[PDB]
Structures are given as C-alpha cells and as structure tokens.
C-alpha cells in the first residue's frame, strides 16, 4: 500500500490470529502461538466504527413525496420536474460512488499505517538485542521467555537487562 | 536457531470485495453495505397510518361517488393514496374535471 507493510514487506496475513486485527506470533523454548495487540486493534475498531457512522448518520432527510402529477398541457413543468429528479439522481450517484471509492482506499491505508507503526514500536525497543530478519520478524540475540515476550508486547521491554547477553551472542 | 517474534495481521475465509480508487475487486476481511437493495414487496402503513386503496377506481371516481366505488369504505384518515395502473372508473359522464391534479395533491394525505 502507501505505507508498504500490508502486501509489502509483510507478505501475507495470519488466519490463526483470531483475537484482533493486529498482533504477534512468537516461539521460544516454552511454547509458541498467536496473540493480538488489543491496544492498536481497539483504536482501529473505535476509529472505523466512528467512520462508518459518520457516513451513515451525516445523511439526514426530512419527509418528502417525490411524486408530482402533470397533465398533457403541462409538459414544460413536467420536464422541469424531471430535470430536478434526474439532476439529484446524477449528483447523489456520483457522490456515493466516488466516496466509497476514495474512502475504501483511505481505510486500507489506515490498516497499513497501524501495522507499520506497530512494527516500529517493537523495532525501537529491541534496538540491537534482536535481528531484523525481514518479513516483519525479529530474531532475538538472547533467550526470551514468556515473561520477556509479554514485555515486548506491553511496551516495557528492558533493554539494559538483556543488553549484556545480546552483546556476546552478536560476536 | 534462537527465539523469534513476528508482527502480523488478520486473514480469514472472507470473499467480500470492495472497489478502491486504485483497484477494483479488492478482497477485504470485513465490510459493510451502504446501499439498500431489498424490499418486502408490500405497501405498508406509513407513519403507522394505513393508506387508502382505491381498487378499480381513481380519485375522481372515489371523490365524486362513481357507482363502482360505493363499496369503498371511507375511513377518517390516511397517509397516502393508492391507485392501480388499470384504475379507470372516474368521470363516467364525459367532461372536464377542473383542477384535477391540484385536488389530488390536496387529498394525498
């Protein structure tokens, strides 16, 4: 996309991660599995929910009847009424078509942005204790147990703690 | 051969497609419809008030009392008027119903 993460440097998506839209997949000595990041998932949910409502509910109409009846000696104002009805039809069709075209692009970029930013929050924590092996994965230069995993996701990874071990494994 | 941690996103059996400004038939995991293309095929009660059905008659015949529309039980209120494309029992004695279109717009509700 624009941010180049979805269908970009992260090739595909995970049918296994069912907790949310964005998350992690880890494996270490004591197991493996998926886990969604709810902080970014909820923000996207709260944001997309507000976006659909803003398109639906900023449309408010009043009671009106479109049916006007004109006899055979009123063809002029009957064609005028047709020009009004056909005029509103052309506008509301072009607006709705272009709106859904444009905002579908924006929404797919918004999900691309969230994956990119979620990736940078992890990269800027594991500065050189982990290896950017590409494909949106990090290989740690140290043993990272399930306690350590839950801290990278939480955003509280202790760099000075594991910097000692990762220095020597880099060789 | 060390520990790893990957960042990723969702995917499912979804077959819905949307159109974007750059690409058509874009498959997405979730979507919603903004366009209503379904109807129940029944003339219902608008504003909780049932409409007025004229059957074989039109408004001219109903308001003047054509002998075919005497069976039309006239209620005290209605939301809109219903005619049929085959309703032709109006002015049985030929002539000109003056301001007929305006009277319809007055009796519409």
């Amino acid at each position, epitope marked *: 996309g624009l941010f180049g993460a979805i269908a970009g440097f992260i090739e595909g998506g995970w*049918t*296994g991660m069912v*907790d*949310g839209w964005y998350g992690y997949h880890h494996q270490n000595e004591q197991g493996s*599995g998926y*886990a969604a990041d709810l902080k970014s*998932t*909820q923000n996207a949910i709260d944001g997309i929910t507000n976006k659909v409502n803003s398109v639906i509910e900023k449309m408010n109409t009043q009671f009106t009847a479109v049916g006007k009846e004109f006899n055979h000696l009123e063809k002029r104002i009957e064609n005028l009424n047709k020009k009004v009805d056909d005029g509103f039809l052309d506008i509301w069709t072009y607006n709705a078509e272009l709106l859904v075209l444009l905002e579908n692009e924006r929404t797919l970029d918004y999900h691309d942005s969230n994956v990119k930013n979620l990736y940078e929050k992890v990269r800027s924590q594991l500065k050189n204790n982990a290896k950017e092996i590409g494909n949106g994965c990090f290989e740690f230069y140290h043993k990272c147990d399930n306690t350590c995993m839950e801290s990278v996701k939480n955003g509280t990874y202790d760099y000075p703690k594991y910097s000692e071990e990762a220095k020597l494994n880099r060789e | 051969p060390g520990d790893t941690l990957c960042i990723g996103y969702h995917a*499912n059996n979804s077959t819905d497609t949307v159109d974007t400004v750059l690409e058509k038939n874009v498959t997405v995991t979730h979507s919603v419809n903004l366009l209503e293309d379904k109807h129940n095929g029944k003339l219902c009660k608008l504003r909780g008030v049932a409409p007025l059905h004229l059957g074989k008659c039109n408004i001219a015949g109903w308001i003047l009392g054509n002998p075919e529309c005497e069976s039309l039980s006239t209620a005290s209120s209605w939301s809109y008027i219903v005619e049929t494309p085959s309703s032709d029992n109006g002015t049985c004695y030929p002539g000109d119903f003056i301001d007929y279109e305006e009277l319809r717009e007055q009796l519409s509700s």
Partner: antibody
Framework: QVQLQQSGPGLVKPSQTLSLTCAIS??????????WNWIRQSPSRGLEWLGR?????????DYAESLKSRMTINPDTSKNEFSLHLKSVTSDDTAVYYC?????????????????WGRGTLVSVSS | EIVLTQSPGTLSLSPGDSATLSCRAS???????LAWYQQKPGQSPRLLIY???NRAADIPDRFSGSGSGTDFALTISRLEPEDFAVYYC??????????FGQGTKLEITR
C-alpha cells in the same frame, strides 16, 4: 437453531481424568468465525474460563495458565463434537461445567462474547 | 492478570426501581472486548450485553451498558420480576485471556 448437548460422568474419583463431551447441532465444530470453549462455575472460584478450540485450516488450542498442564480439548469432525480432558483431578475441580461458543468480529464491530451456553454438567469429585 | 471487581455484592431493590451495577477492573480494558451476562436462578448464563453498549439478541430495552477504560456499568431502567438474577461482567486480554467478576445478585426484596 443452534443447540449444545453435554454428556459425561457426574462423579470422578479424586485422582483420575475428568472427561466431558459437547455435541453441536446447527453449527459446525470445524467452523471458522467462531470458537468453542469450556467454562466451569464453582461457588468457591466464581466463573473460570478453561480453554478453547478453533479450526482455521488447522486445529488450535488455548488453555488457561492456571492449569495449562492437565487440560486438553480434542475435536472430532466425523461426529461434529468436541470433548474435555482434565487430568489429575482434585476437589478444586468440582464445579458445574459449560461448553460455550465465541462469536467475535460481527457488526457493530469486534468484541469476544459468549452467546451460546450449554445446559451445564455438574461434576463432583469424591472418594 | 486483569481482575474484574463488581459492586455491590448484593443489591436489594423493589420491582420497578432502577438499578445500576458497576464493574471496576485492575487495568485498562478494551471497550469492545467487555461483555455482561445474566444468570437466572437455576439456569445457565446468558449473554446480555456485548461490546459494552450493545444488547444481545432478544434483550429488552431496559438493559443498557456503559463505561470505558477501568470502570464499567450495567443499568436496568425498570425492574421486572424476571430480572431477579445474578449479573456477571467479562473481559478479554491477551495475557489472562478470559476473566469474569464475582457477580452481583439482584435481590428483589424489602
């Protein structure tokens, strides 16, 4: 529409493996967009979620870290059911067990909620 | 990890009165992943509200959910006799996946 039928021994010798099964009607155990869970209810420990199973071209399982060792959930596609297996049972495990379905990611949006709850099988363990 | 603490334990209230049941968490809770459940006497639990604001299927208008972050609530506007039951809140995180509350009892009495 959708119904859940539970069955299993109501009494367990307090050392053996607790076993319970849950047959599904109307929905599919190997269905996506849903997830099948086990939850117990003991007057001492409230409502405890135990584990879940879901199929996404592959069978997954997630267990509560409180047990994480003695529980297993096996599916069976030929009968469209899924069962529970709680090994090394103690008197802490005496509770009412429910099988229950998860329905996340429907409109209005997201949110893991339990909507279909089984009738409930009370399993006492006693010597 | 995330502990849900409801209050009050028991709630004495006459039929027709308006009830508010609260549910406070030890940490922040994802608004969408919070839900409410009703357990009528002798029957199994039953989904009442999901996504913190959305009534479940076949749920009367009396029930409405609220809250965000740490504190949530469940308000019943007019108590029917069939509302004598126990109500549980439930949340989801990626560490302690499914956690409930101890449940409020709606003791319809005086």
């Amino acid at each position: 529409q959708v119904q859940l039928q539970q069955s299993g021994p109501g009494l367990v010798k307090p050392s053996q493996t607790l076993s319970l099964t849950c047959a599904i009607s109307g929905d599919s155990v190997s269905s996506n967009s849903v997830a099948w869970n086990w939850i117990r209810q003991s007057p001492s420990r409230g409502l405890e979620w135990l584990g879940r199973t879901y199929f996404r071209s592959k069978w997954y399982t997630d267990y509560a870290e409180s047990l994480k060792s003695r529980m297993t959930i096996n599916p069976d596609t030929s009968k469209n059911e899924f069962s529970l297996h709680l090994k090394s049972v103690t008197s802490d495990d005496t509770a009412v067990y429910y099988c229950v379905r998860g329905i996340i990611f429907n409109w209005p949006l997201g949110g893991w909620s339990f909507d279909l709850w089984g009738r409930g099988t009370l399993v006492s363990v006693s010597s | 990890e995330i502990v849900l603490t409801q209050s009050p334990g028991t709630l004495s209230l006459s039929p027709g009165d308006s009830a508010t049941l609260s549910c406070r968490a030890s940490q922040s809770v994802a608004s969408s992943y919070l839900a409410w459940y009703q357990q009528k006497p002798g029957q199994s639990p039953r989904l009442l509200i999901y996504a913190t604001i959305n009534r479940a299927a076949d749920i009367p208008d009396r029930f409405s959910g609220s809250g965000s972050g740490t504190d949530f609530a469940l308000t019943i506007s007019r108590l029917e006799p069939e509302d004598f039951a126990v109500y549980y809140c439930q949340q989801f995180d990626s560490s302690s996946m499914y956690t409930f509350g101890q449940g409020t009892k709606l003791e319809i009495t005086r």
